[PDB]
Design an enzyme around this catalytic site. Structure first.
Site, short mmCIF file in Angstrom:
data_model
loop_
_atom_site.label_atom_id
_atom_site.label_comp_id
_atom_site.label_asym_id
_atom_site.label_seq_id
_atom_site.Cartn_x
_atom_site.Cartn_y
_atom_site.Cartn_z
N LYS A 1 -1.02 -1.64 1.65
CA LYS A 1 -2.44 -1.88 1.89
C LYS A 1 -2.81 -1.56 3.33
CE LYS A 1 -3.59 -4.74 -2.00
NZ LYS A 1 -4.15 -3.43 -2.49
N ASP B 1 -3.21 2.27 -0.14
CA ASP B 1 -4.46 1.77 -0.75
C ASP B 1 -5.42 1.33 0.34
OD1 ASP B 1 -6.46 0.59 -2.28
OD2 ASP B 1 -5.09 -0.55 -3.56
N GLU C 1 -4.94 5.90 -2.49
CA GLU C 1 -5.64 5.12 -3.52
C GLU C 1 -6.94 4.56 -2.96
OE1 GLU C 1 -3.21 2.16 -5.41
OE2 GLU C 1 -4.94 0.96 -6.10
N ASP D 1 -9.34 3.42 -8.03
CA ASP D 1 -9.08 2.06 -8.50
C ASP D 1 -10.45 1.42 -8.73
OD1 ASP D 1 -8.39 -0.61 -8.94
OD2 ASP D 1 -6.98 -0.75 -7.28
N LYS E 1 -7.42 -1.54 -13.77
CA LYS E 1 -7.34 -2.95 -14.10
C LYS E 1 -7.94 -3.22 -15.47
CE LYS E 1 -7.23 -4.62 -9.32
NZ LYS E 1 -7.03 -3.24 -8.76
N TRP F 1 1.41 -4.03 -12.36
CA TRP F 1 1.37 -5.02 -11.28
C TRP F 1 0.96 -6.39 -11.83
CZ3 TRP F 1 -1.69 -8.72 -9.20
CH2 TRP F 1 -1.31 -9.24 -7.95
#
Ligand SMILES: C[N+]1(C)C[C@H](O)C[C@@H]1C(=O)O
Ligand SMILES: C[N+]1(C)C[C@H](O)C[C@@H]1C(=O)O
Ligand SMILES: C[N+]1(C)C[C@H](O)C[C@@H]1C(=O)O
Ligand SMILES: C[N+]1(C)C[C@H](O)C[C@@H]1C(=O)O
Ligand SMILES: [Mg+2]
Ligand SMILES: [Mg+2]
Ligand SMILES: [Mg+2]
Ligand SMILES: [Mg+2]
Ligand SMILES: [Mg+2]
Ligand SMILES: [Mg+2]
Ligand SMILES: [Mg+2]
Ligand SMILES: [Mg+2]
Ligand SMILES: [Mg+2]
Ligand SMILES: [Mg+2]
Lengths: 369, 369, 369, 369
Positions: free
Chosen positions: B164, B194, B219, B242, B266, B321
């Protein structure tokens, strides 16, 4: 409320330790134009417009005064507390000439702030930061000397530097960029390289191609937006518009079509604070970092720039540039805009927070009532 | 079969050794929402939705419960064995709110699986792998410390890491990426970086430009899909969506127009398993690697993610994840989802294969019949 | 100044002579949510948000109150005189949910106006017109029935009509449009035809192709902006966006890429007056006509729409739509928003110019301090 | 469960009152290929593939049996309850040849449905409609003759007509379309005009240009998708793809890039029900109407088309076309697929709901164990 008087002033600003060199303009002294709007109540507001020589942009001191003289009689009686209405009224009197319209716009916001007892930044959405970053722009010069100056300005506290290039063989510009980077790397200082409309696409391509490891953004490398749109796909450094961002429509084109990664934006060019605030909102929606600058000028235009800059989301704020370091005499010695540690503290008083020593300007070159 | 009851639960999940930092969200405890659907036969299915703080995405725990309370009375009597019909019925009651609809969708698949005596993955096309890869996502931190953690997680067995970045000067992100790569190079570990919507295009361009030798995919570097479409031609690293992949229509746009090279997807965002399966089929047709993740949550949502992930062609599976490592108390101690050696074993029982200890949740905050 | 208290109210609005039929939502009674912000001084401002049923947009009454409950504790102590700072503060508490944020935005502008002694329109650039045009929107119904209502409403003074279509065979929609045009041609009345996301491209193409001699603009014919971009070059009628205009970023895309010829824009959807004013400036720079509407609601949201509408350049003002003709009981018996002669007078008082009778709403459903 | 045996059958289907004339294929008798899959338990499922002559598409009866002979030995032992796993297994044995793979796909869904006690449509998301619309497709013939048949079939209850054109001067096609429209206008009947790959862009342009008042969609006017993309912006009628929709990837291109307004889609072409269901979800997300058809064939392929068709959102369902009216002997005398009132009832039984009389086919032409 109604406008009762409009006064236009001519005033001279010599460049301390000049000249100041831009690829498109070298100047030794600047002619600024001040505007005083007096309401029927007697309350006054101040505006300012100061082109950086007559060749930088389609604007000049004599032209500013001609434009103001054209519009002024048609503005007597207008409500100065309504910046959009007032802007439309100006458009009804003169097409274009944003740099002159901006002076009236700024005077009206100053007057509004004084009337309501509020800072101009709070009329524009609110103070997001009491102290804003600035950036230092070098002149064109020998690579080593420019690198030395860059190191000094970083030591002074400037969080960003802008290196001016162009008007000479690009090898010298590239050597300058490399030598500057060697002295400022690892300081967290952000870097812009400004071609001021002077690079053919040949040279803009070369500059970026040769320096992927140097994290500059390429500011207005080429003269036209069409040339910039043509090189963008082949340039791996972010590209910012400056001179090309001449109005809100152009900003909408550039944002909507992904033609740039940010802006160096001048208040007078865009037409004043009413339009600059909309510009700010467009950039925020698209995460496009920008500065809030002008071409040149003293406390009045500098305070206007600082007020809008104080409303910018901090992560997007590329700084507020002001001519203060090159101006010997402030208009307001108690509250005037000063750079301290590479940053600018927002004035705390109502309106622009600036009370200019009107005596300095001389009698108005034109008055209207 | 008909739905006879719907029960909505509020439940708290503290972050072990937190907080967990995302450029768009730092959280210390998560509020998950569970949904129990009871058929007229008495058979029950379970769903779950748990936003990762209220600022990550347009969704939040209170909003999930409001959305479920809106739809629930209109779903009593519906056939839970028909996931597409059921989804259309939800759309007939409330526009958008995929993250809430997803909980009903997942409960229905669980119920279907229990009723027919089949695993959810087998209702979604079939088990392609009994054990699926996972990936470990680091928080934002000091470069050396993040590199140390990355090395440890590779040693644990994780085949992929996600670093991240964002919310600070990009030089620090780049230093982090370089230090991580130095510790994991030559291990065959795949790398994602990300930005969680936080990078202006300026910085996304710089990150890629400076690191061609580091094989990350970038990402969601920028906030909007429009910004991503604008930088893509100038970025030599693969780009994954994402947050931008908010529905199947957007996935179709991105796949059909070549706007990205993969997805972090997701389940709750896309609206549940019915839609996620279609998403999977689109990616397979275009060789677009993707993960099957969610924002957060315990055994119920984790099992749903693992089931769809078990159907993915292995060469395209970027992992599942789950928040399990940050959750102290499992809902199902006998069959709950656990990471082992950087991978996740699919539960073997019918439906999701999860029997939650319903006692843990407390009485329903809302019940419908 | 600082926010001391926030109070949330729930209130029912029965549809007079109901129901109201949109292709995407049929409504018999609307659930409005009011917000009262109280400063330390005791001065209060009012806001309102009222989704037009739960299937029109990703918004609903229970969702409005859940979003406000999430944000309110984090807003105690904030300075309500800074709308942009305040908006960022809300973004820091909850992602998205513009329709709920808008209620806080509007209450803050109301309070600001009361504090400074200025009308909200004069905080947004200034009053360009005291008498604002409205438009009448017909529900879906039988062709001859709708044509009669169209003629009746033209006679009442409405300068523009919007005809809702969709949800049935398109030949009936085309017949309705033709019969309406027969009644209103030669009256100088402008025409919009609203598909409310309901037409496949097949049918939108047919509607335009068959009716070149009827001067409608086609408003949100298709469900997605992607579908609208795809038919745009094959449609000779101007196309307006409504539902697709979800945020300023999407407006910037549509304007910058020339994807539409105008907008029906709702204040709650865009996120409040701060964003709506920027939206207005964007449209003015590109000569894109637009309305200033909302989904539904009483005097509070209606006054907010009227105030921004009063700042629009008259030649670009497609009208301010309000739900008043369908609402039996006004919140402010003396100065509430009323349509007269198909137009709306801007209130004279400071702020929104509205003083709600709080007793009409019952006690707050939620209070924060 | 595991596949124990695969049996391939060859069977002739004489065209009742033949022949049937497509611009790309004239047929007098069709050679269908049936497949029976037998599980270890003895439970069996049926599939079917029947190219409509050898020149309509890159498929033929001898080719179907050769492809099945190639794949069948590699499928013994496979789990037929996993359609996606099974499809990948087939891809691992033979590239392409969707029309043959589809027969195995369909037999496996039949078997799955029988095993679980569920209708195939309920394995594909659920029954949205028990009574599925069909459409009637006229062969090429004389304008007055075709106009009569059109009127007759509208009276029989078909809610949509497809008129085949091409293979002759386009003025005769245009005359046919005009005369058909004269008969069916005002009956609420939808119209498609199918060029079956046969029109040069010259003629497709002319057909649309001359007939703006006739509400046809133009189905596969030109031979290649490239030709269709090239005329699309110059054609005001909706354009549907049929033959060009060869796989899910092409559907993703067409939808994502907005190259068409709908589809005539054949189950065998796309590769079976697993892919057809994904195709359905893609179209639903983009509001693209489509049919669920095949090239030709009896009760087995007809039931498969009916089951997927029964899952389509009714407003997007352009119909299920079957060859039954041209087939003298049904495979299932009791529950075979029959058109009634221009519509088709979904069978009630588990699986496809069809039980073929195996003795009609003769012994298998190929058996695998
Ligand atoms: C804004 N400056 C820093 C100062 C000069 O006015 C020009 C320069 C620029 O072009 O960005
Ligand atoms: C899915 N994660 C790995 C876990 C967090 O929910 C967010 C992060 C991502 O944005 O990809
Ligand atoms: C603004 N209206 C007239 C009122 C309804 O909120 C929706 C409708 C429109 O979509 O334009
Ligand atoms: C589906 N049909 C009506 C039957 C034939 O297989 C071809 C034709 C069509 O191309 O649409
Ligand atoms: Mg520094
Ligand atoms: Mg510059
Ligand atoms: Mg490993
Ligand atoms: Mg992510
Ligand atoms: Mg009129
Ligand atoms: Mg509308
Ligand atoms: Mg308190
Ligand atoms: Mg009929
Ligand atoms: Mg066809
Ligand atoms: Mg055998």
């Amino acid at each position: 409320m109604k406008i009762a008087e409009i006064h236009v002033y001519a005033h001279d600003l010599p460049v301390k330790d000049g000249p100041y060199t831009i690829a498109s303009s070298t100047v030794w002294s600047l002619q600024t134009t001040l505007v005083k709007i007096v309401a029927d109540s007697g309350l006054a507001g101040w505006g300012e417009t100061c082109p950086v020589g007559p060749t930088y942009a389609p604007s000049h001191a004599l032209g500013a005064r001609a434009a103001l003289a054209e519009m002024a009689p048609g503005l007597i009686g207008a409500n100065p507390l309504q910046p959009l209405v007032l802007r439309r009224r100006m458009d009804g009197l003169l097409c274009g000439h944003n740099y002159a319209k901006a002076a009236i716009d700024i005077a009206a916001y100053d007057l509004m702030g004084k009337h309501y007892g509020v800072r101009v930044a709070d009329l524009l959405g609110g103070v997001a930061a009491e102290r804003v970053p600035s950036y230092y722009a070098t002149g064109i010069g020998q690579p080593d000397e420019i690198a030395r100056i860059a190191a000094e300005k970083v030591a002074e506290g400037f969080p960003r530097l802008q290196i001016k290039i162009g008007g000479r063989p690009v090898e010298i510009d590239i050597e300058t960029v490399r030598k500057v980077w060697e002295r400022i790397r690892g300081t967290g200082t952000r870097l812009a390289v400004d071609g001021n409309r002077s690079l053919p696409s040949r040279d803009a391509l070369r500059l970026s191609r040769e320096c992927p490891e140097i994290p500059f953004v390429l500011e207005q490398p080429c003269n036209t937006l069409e040339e910039i749109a043509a090189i963008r796909g082949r340039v791996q450094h972010g590209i910012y518009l400056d001179e090309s961002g001449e109005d809100l429509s152009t900003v909408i084109r550039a944002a909507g079509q992904g033609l740039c990664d940010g802006f160096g934006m001048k208040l007078t060019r865009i037409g004043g604070l009413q339009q600059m605030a909309a510009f700010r909102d467009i950039c925020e929606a698209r995460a496009l970092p920008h500065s809030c600058d002008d071409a040149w000028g003293g406390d009045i235009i500098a305070a206007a720039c600082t007020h809008i800059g104080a409303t910018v989301q901090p992560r997007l704020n590329e700084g507020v540039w002001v001519a203060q370091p090159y101006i010997a005499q402030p208009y307001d010695e108690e509250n005037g805009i000063r750079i301290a540690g590479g940053h600018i503290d927002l004035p705390k008083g109502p309106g622009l927070g600036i009370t200019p020593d009107e005596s300095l300007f001389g009698p108005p070159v034109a008055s209207f009532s």
